[PDB]
Amino acid sequence: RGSFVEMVDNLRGKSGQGYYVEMTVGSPPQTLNILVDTGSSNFAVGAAPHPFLHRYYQRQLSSTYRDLRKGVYVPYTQGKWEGELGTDLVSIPHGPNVTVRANIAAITESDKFFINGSNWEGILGLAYAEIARPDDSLEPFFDSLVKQTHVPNLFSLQLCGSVGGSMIIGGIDHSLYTGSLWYTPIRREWYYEVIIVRVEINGQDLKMDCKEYNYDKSIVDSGTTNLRLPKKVFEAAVASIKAASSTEKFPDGFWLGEQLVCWQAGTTPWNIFPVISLYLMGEVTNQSFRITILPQQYLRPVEDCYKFAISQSSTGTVMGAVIMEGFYVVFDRARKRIGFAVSACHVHDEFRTAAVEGPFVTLDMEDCGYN
Ligand SMILES: CN1C(=O)C[C@@](C)(c2cccc(NC(=O)c3ccc(OCC(F)(F)F)cn3)c2)N=C1N
Ligand code: NA
Ligand code: NA
């Protein structure tokens, strides 16, 4: 409890490609790099020699493998994968010193799924059975972990945004954050769904009906890059960001993520860009708190050229790696809540730092949840 030195720094990544943890599958152990994803619930790994893959799960080499004689087809907004289900023994070398029998989808065919030049070979879905494929009876990895061991039912993520971070499995490490943790309820256990009750650009309320902020949900997703905002909120959001930053100008396609914008080295105008604060539902009736992110988070370097990493959505708000890089995030599954604290490692400047602040008084927070 509170100290987990062995798990500190167990995440690696490359800008834009996601954060991955080393895992082993089967006996003898086959080592793989696995994308950490709080936005999905399948443990799926490459199982065949796709060209983009450094390595892949070779089921034939494992004595502990058990076929479930069952297929799964998984389409996404763009790209898909399909696979064959089974179970085998899984470990996390730089995680808890346990071994569990987990479901694994062996990916036999995929499209627009693996990334050319990336260093991961599979994906660890850390969300709940409700959104598992093909259905809620396929038990996600973290459930199997907690069912079969003494590992406490919670994990936490410090994503530092070439890149690194920590996934503390079964606890919290106090060195990873400064100040206090503030908790927001998990509304329903499927995605890590939360409720945003208020949005400020540079301390300026959007004055939108709060239901709009959560239309049709808001979730915390380490497998998404952007802060994704519902269409109507996004319009409001950029309009207010465009205005707060009207001190300089950029093409209209830039705000739509259809082009990059570039400045010279040692000289990006951070300060003409506003802070963004999301107030989240608190643990107590009529009590909220707010998280504050910097343009450092929503203006992401591409290779000085940057992409605007706030985008519109038809699936609701997504607090991707943009938000998460500001914070140490606690997925407290045992108490159905998400904790936020200022990350000890977040990227800032000398004028502004990311922040988690409370308590604030906010009424009718229940009306902010879409049904
Ligand atoms: C959004 N999403 C999906 O569309 C489906 C799924 C399974 C998925 C599938 C394939 C790839 C990914 N995610 C990524 O490639 C990715 C890339 C960069 C990411 O962040 C990088 C940075 F940290 F922002 F720099 C996070 N995830 C997610 N999970 C999701 N969370
Ligand atoms: Na247990
Ligand atoms: Na601390």
- Around ligand 1, the residues with Cβ closer than 6 Å are 15-18, 37, 39-40, 76, 113, 123, 161, 221, 223-225, 321
Torsion angle, alpha carbons of 174, 176, 181, 182, to 10:
-160
Dist. CA 340 → ligand 3 center (Å): 12
Residue 37 appears among annotated catalytic residues: yes
Say if residues 167 and 11 touch (Cβ distance below 8 Å): yes
Residue 135 appears among annotated catalytic residues: no
Question: Of the residues 9, 37, 67, 135, which is catalytic?
Answer: 37
CATH architecture of 19-151: Beta Barrel (2.40)
The Cα 153–Cα 145 span in angstroms is: 9
Give the three-class secondary structure for 101: strand
Query: What's the distance, CA 192 to chain centroid?
Result: 10
Say if residues 40 and 223 touch (Cβ distance below 8 Å): yes
The Cα 170–Cα 6 span in angstroms is: 12
Q: Which atom of ligand 1 is found nearest the CA of 223?
A: 27
Q: Which helix (H) or strand (E) holds 85?
A: strand 80-91
Tokens 């598992």 correspond to: 132
Dist. CA 151 → ligand 2 center (Å): 6
The Cα 267–Cα 264 span in angstroms is: 6
Residue bearing the CA closest to ligand 1, atom 28: 223
Mutate to test the pocket of ligand 1, among 116, 225, 322 (most ligand atoms within 8 A of CB): 225
Give the three-class secondary structure for 296: helix
Start and end residues for every CATH 2.40.70.10 domain found in the chain:
19-151, 152-371
> Kindly report the CA angle at 340 between 336 and 342, in degrees rounded to 5?
165
User: What CATH number belongs to 152-371?
Assistant: 2.40.70.10
Say if residues 197 and 288 touch (Cβ distance below 8 Å): yes
The Cα 330–Cα 323 span in angstroms is: 14
Going by C-beta distance under 8 Å and a sequence separation of 6 or more, which residues neighbour residue 159?
A: 11, 13, 19, 165, 222, 321, 324, 325, 343
Dist. CA 19 → ligand 1 center (Å): 9
The Cα 111–Cα 80 span in angstroms is: 5
Using DSSP bridges, classify how beta strands 317-319 and 218-220 pair: parallel, antiparallel or unpaired. Answer: parallel
The Cα 93–Cα 191 span in angstroms is: 26
Residue bearing the CA closest to ligand 1, atom 13: 223
Question: Of the residues 88, 173, 221, 332, which is catalytic?
Answer: 221
The Cα 94–Cα 371 span in angstroms is: 41
Give the three-class secondary structure for 360: strand
Say if residues 26 and 65 touch (Cβ distance below 8 Å): yes
Mutate to test the pocket of ligand 1, among 17, 34, 158 (most ligand atoms within 8 A of CB): 17
Q: What single DSSP character describes residue 188?
A: S
Mutate to test the pocket of ligand 1, among 34, 36, 40, 159 (most ligand atoms within 8 A of CB): 40
* Expt. technique: X-ray
Q: What single DSSP character describes residue 145?
A: H
Dist. CA 175 → ligand 3 center (Å): 5
Ligand nearest to the CA of 142: 2
Q: How many C-alpha atoms does 162 have within 13 Å on its Cβ side? A: 10
Using DSSP bridges, classify how beta strands 122-125 and 30-37 pair: parallel, antiparallel or unpaired. Answer: parallel
The Cα 27–Cα 54 span in angstroms is: 20
The Cα 330–Cα 340 span in angstroms is: 6
Residue bearing the CA closest to ligand 1, atom 5: 76
Dist. CA 194 → ligand 1 center (Å): 19
| Resolution for this PDB entry, in angstroms | 2.1
